Each structure stands twice: as C-alpha cells, then as structure tokens.
Structure 1
Amino acid sequence: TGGSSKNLGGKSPGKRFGIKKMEGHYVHAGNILATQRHFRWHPGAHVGLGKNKCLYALEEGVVRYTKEVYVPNPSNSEAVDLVTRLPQGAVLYKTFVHVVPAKPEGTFKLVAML
C-alpha cells in the first residue's frame, strides 16, 4: 500500500529562547539577560538591546523585573496608531528588565602629597 505522508520538514531544533537570568541575580557587564524572538520583555534601565532582540546587562548589578507604562517611539508608526485608537482612559503596559548598579562609580585615592 502506498504510504505517502505528504508533510515535510517538521524538524528543527529548538532555539532555546527564554529567560537566562532571574530576578535578583547578580550580573556582570555584558551578560545576556534574556533572548526572545518577539518582544516579550523590553530593555529597561542599563539593559541594552541586541539586533536579534537579545537583552544584555550594561552595568554590574542586580537584575529586576517591572511592569511599566509604554510610550512608543513617534518614529515607529504601527505602535503610534495602536496608541492612538485606545479609549481615552487607558494606558499601555509592558514588562521590562533592569540592572541595579552595585559597585560605586569610582573612588578618590591620594596619589602624592607635595
């Protein structure tokens, strides 16, 4: 009996998208925080956005997650319109990641007393 199943190429590995660090994790500058294919979490304070929508930590610190108000860039039109048609009482919210800096910025050392 002809057993042809017409479907092809279901097979891909998973991309291991997801959250790499968790709230209250210590982080060094450069660590990737989470990696996603669509924006699930947006970059907050001290979190840089990679061209593939990676989130990495800019400072040395503690990673925090947050629900905050979303005010799209006036250059990006779709989001501008989505913001436009809302009923007059409602604001948009999203989830952000943050780094909270640990090390102080610097120190004043006494080099020489002349």
Structure 2
Amino acid sequence: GRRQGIKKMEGHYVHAGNIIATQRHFRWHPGAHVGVGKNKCLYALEEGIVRYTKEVYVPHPRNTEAVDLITRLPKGAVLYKTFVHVVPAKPEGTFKLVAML
C-alpha cells in the first residue's frame, strides 16, 4: 500500500505548504494556488479552503503528446479534468498607523 490519495477533502482549511494529494499519475491537476512537486504531489501555496472543480483542459503547446492528442479530437470534443484550488482566506496584509510624524 503506497498510501496515496486525497489528504485534504473539499471545504477543509489548509495552511501554506500543506500537501493536498499524492498521486502516481495526474489524477488531479493543480488549480489556483496549488503547486506541484517532482512526485506530482499537490501542495498548497496559500492559506484557505480546498475546492475541487471540473475545468477545460488546454495543455501546453510544448507538451507534444497532449498537443497531438488534442489535435486528434473531433470538432465536437472538449477535454475536461479535475482541478484542485485553494481559496485564500486571510487578506495578504493591512495598513496600520505606525507613527504620527
């Protein structure tokens, strides 16, 4: 047992650097504020709540395998994949009165 799978489910609060999922193959894709690793493990780049969505898959032009698979699609198909997002909770900062000069 490799003990792979989703580590943090939907609606779960997440801190920066938390690992969301560990996968051998891209079962889930990095979405907003979710970074990937060498092991293709999805970690969180911000602090917030995890959401799982279905999004249109437009792969990178340099990815020749994904590119020609996209080409072989008819003019009826559009590829979809499951993405993982972190909706950030806290604002990135506040303005405080330091001194009255």
Is 1:26 the counterpart of 2:26? The answer is no
Query: In the TM superposition, what is the alpha-carbon distance from 1:40 to its structure 2 partner?
Result: 0.3
**Counterparts of 2:4 and 2:15 in 1: how far apart (Å)?**
21
Q: TM-score, normalised by structure 2?
A: 0.98
Q: Which runs of 5+ in 1 are unaligned?
A: 1-13
Identity of aligned residues (%): 90
Q: Please identify the structure whose Cα radius of gyration is greater.
A: 1
Q: Pick the aligned partner of 2:27 from 40, 44, 50.
A: 40
Q: Say which SS state the counterpart of residue 15 (structure 1) adopts.
A: coil
Distance 1:111 1:86 in 2: 59
Residues 51-90 of structure 1 deviation map (CA, whole Å, 9 limit, x = unaligned): 1110000000000000000001100100001100111121
Give the aligned partner of residue 7 of structure 1: none
CA distance in 2, matches of 1:76, 1:86: 16
Structure 2 CA distance, aligned partners of 1:16 and 1:77?
Answer: 32
Give ranges in structure 2 of 5+ residues lacking alignment.
none
When normalised by structure 1's length, the TM-score is 0.87
Q: Give the aligned length.
A: 101
Q: 4+ residue stretches of structure 1 with deviation over 2 A?
A: none
Q: Alignment partner for residue 55 of structure 1, among 42, 49, 65?
A: 42
Q: Which has the higher contact order (CA 8 A, sep 6+)?
A: 2
